[PDB]
């Protein structure tokens, strides 16, 4: 009995695990996730960078990062407004790095940006036409999280 | 070993409960839930009050209740049309109460409403402009449920 | 302990099954699923017919099939642009069948369609106006999956 009951329960658990994964797939699909493409999502709430990082981390994601023009366009279409990107030069001025580590491989700065304006701007937002502008991390912009392809 | 397998099962169940809660958190977020705010959802189906209340209940929610102007605006935007609110005066005519308890505090009544028109109107709907009107609970309005903050 | 823990685990698994069921109901509702009606979902990605079939099967759904004018309109609203239907005449040229088997019980063919134009057209797409046109299965159309009522 015992061993049989246990084996049966292990079978149910694995079935439930598959069932949850299906739920996750269907959710992503319904939200527009494209096949083999990163899933970007927003609640359309504007908050300071620290909060954005906190929120995405809590959802086990990361602040959205465009690796190329294709992803930059996808992020733009999702936010529909100015949104923080997972890129900052907080650690070392002038040297932008992804919040997940690494230096920039792709950028789409606006005319005369980055300018580290005034007191200093260490964060980055994707604005009009998907162009970038560095801004104060304390400002409040749309939170856009990223999930695996 | 039976105990090793049992210990693994506890870990599997725990891992699963955590993943399921993450799936719930991501869904809410993707549905527009703002941090520390209750969120509203609708399938855009029109139905009499009894069915909205029942439906929201089986989803572990409640028929939408605007506790203030911000929330009133949030419900209006989600609903897009006339929707039932979780407010009625079925228990004592003239005394509006929340479906979950308590006397109505914040209100956004239209001019000359509530009027318990004709044979009577005990339910409440939020109309296109966000104002409220009391109506028959048998009328079919959009089903909007709210889930805790 | 062993038998007590084993019994509790059974209770834990059943509780999780109920929770996931609920998560599934809430998601369907959030996506506009109406009571007693099938629901169609799309990520708005264009792909060849074989890919749509593969994707819907992976979501445990089927490629969208309109059984009447109501569902035909429903699918059209969801897709927003030309999408594949789960109908093809791949088995026997001229004999359109559901991907789920059987002859069509309802059709909305545009004038002089289906015509197996040129090199051949064995798949079907619901155009922007709801009418049907048979087209090449290799063309990229919007993926719309169907789930039961
Ligand atoms: C003079 O005051 C107005 O008189 C109208 C005619 O009696 C009222 O409208 C009627 O309301 C009926 C509801 O009992 C019914 O409406 S329903 O179909 O929407 O249920 C009648 O068809 C309708 O003519 C009017 O009531 C207000 O507008 C109605 C459309 C309805 O929304 C009511 O709930 C409103 O109170 C009434 N207006 C006022 C301000 O007294
Ligand atoms: C019922 O099974 C399916 O029948 C279809 C109709 O015959 C097959 O498609 C046809 O395949 C032909 C070659 O066999 C030819 O395609 S080709 O030009 O690419 O050669 C016809 O134009 C085409 O309509 C279908 O075959 C499969 O799909 C084809 C598009 C092609 O990729 C073939 O290699 C495939 O086998 C066939 N499906 C299967 C799974 O056999
Ligand atoms: C007012 C300043 O204008 C310029 C921008 O690049 C800066 O970010 C700042 O907004
Ligand atoms: C351009 C061609 O026109 C004709 C149609 O029957 C074909 O499906 C195709 O659309
Ligand atoms: Ca700096
Ligand atoms: Ca800087
Ligand atoms: Ca700047
Ligand atoms: Ca009354
Ligand atoms: Ca009166
Ligand atoms: Ca009344
Ligand atoms: Ca009234
Ligand atoms: Ca053919
Ligand atoms: Ca051919
Ligand atoms: Ca054909
Ligand atoms: Ca054709
Ligand atoms: Cl800064
Ligand atoms: Cl009533
Ligand atoms: Cl074809
Ligand atoms: Zn979902």
């Amino acid at each position: 009995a015992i061993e049989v009951k246990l084996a049966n329960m292990e079978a149910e658990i694995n079935t439930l695990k598959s069932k949850l994964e299906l739920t996750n797939k269907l959710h992503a699909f319904s939200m527009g996730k494209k096949s083999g493409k990163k899933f970007f999502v927003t609640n359309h709430e504007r908050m300071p960078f620290s909060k954005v990082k906190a929120l995405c981390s809590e959802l086990r994601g990361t602040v959205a990062i465009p690796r190329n023009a294709e992803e930059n366009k996808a992020i733009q279409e999702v936010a529909k407004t100015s949104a923080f990107l997972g890129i900052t030069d907080e650690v070392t001025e002038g040297q932008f790095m992804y919040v997940t580590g690494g230096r920039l491989t792709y950028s789409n700065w606006k005319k005369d940006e980055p300018n580290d304006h005034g007191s200093g701007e260490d964060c980055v937002t994707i604005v009009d036409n998907g162009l970038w502008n560095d801004i104060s991390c304390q400002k409040k912009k749309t939170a856009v999280c990223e999930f695996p392809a």
Side-chain angles (χ1 to χ4, degrees), chain A:
Chain A
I2 299 302
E3 295 89 347
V4 179
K5 196 175 174 293
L6 184 56
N8 292 166
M9 281 180 278
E10 296 170 326
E12 292 176 63
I13 288 181
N14 299 150
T15 298
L16 226 34
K17 294 201 290 174
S18 306
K19 198 171 174 177
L20 178 61
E21 210 65 77
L22 184 66
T23 296
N24 291 154
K25 282 185 178 64
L26 179 55
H27 174 65
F29 173 83
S30 73
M31 291 308 291
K33 183 190 183 304
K34 303 298 181 291
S35 315
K37 302 299 193 180
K38 303 190 301 179
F39 180 36
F40 296 116
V41 57
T42 184
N43 61 338
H44 296 288
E45 185 188 346
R46 295 172 62 254
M47 62 199 82
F49 192 68
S50 56
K51 293 290 192 61
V52 176
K53 283 191 299 178
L55 187 45
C56 300
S57 192
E58 199 176 293
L59 298 176
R60 297 299 288 293
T62 53
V63 190
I65 292 172
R67 296 293 175 158
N68 54 50
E70 303 84 271
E71 295 175 5
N72 197 84
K73 194 177 303 90
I75 294 178
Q76 165 183 216
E77 300 170 295
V78 168
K80 304 173 190 303
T81 43
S82 302
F84 277 119
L85 295 181
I87 302 171
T88 77
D89 67 331
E90 288 183 300
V91 169
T92 307
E93 183 55 41
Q95 290 295 2
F96 286 85
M97 297 179 106
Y98 301 118
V99 294
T100 48
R103 290 194 52 202
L104 264 42
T105 46
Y106 162 85
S107 58
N108 191 63
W109 294 109
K110 196 178 182 179
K111 291 179 179 176
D112 301 317
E113 304 301 331
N115 63 10
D116 192 57
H117 204 85
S119 38
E121 302 187 311
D122 291 351
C123 279
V124 183
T125 50
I126 180 176
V127 295
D128 298 301
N129 305 71
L131 276 293
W132 305 359
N133 169 35
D134 60 324
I135 64 155
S136 187
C137 299
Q138 273 58 255
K139 281 190 181 171
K140 296 174 175 53
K141 305 295 167 182
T142 304
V144 185
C145 303
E146 176 185 325
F147 300 94

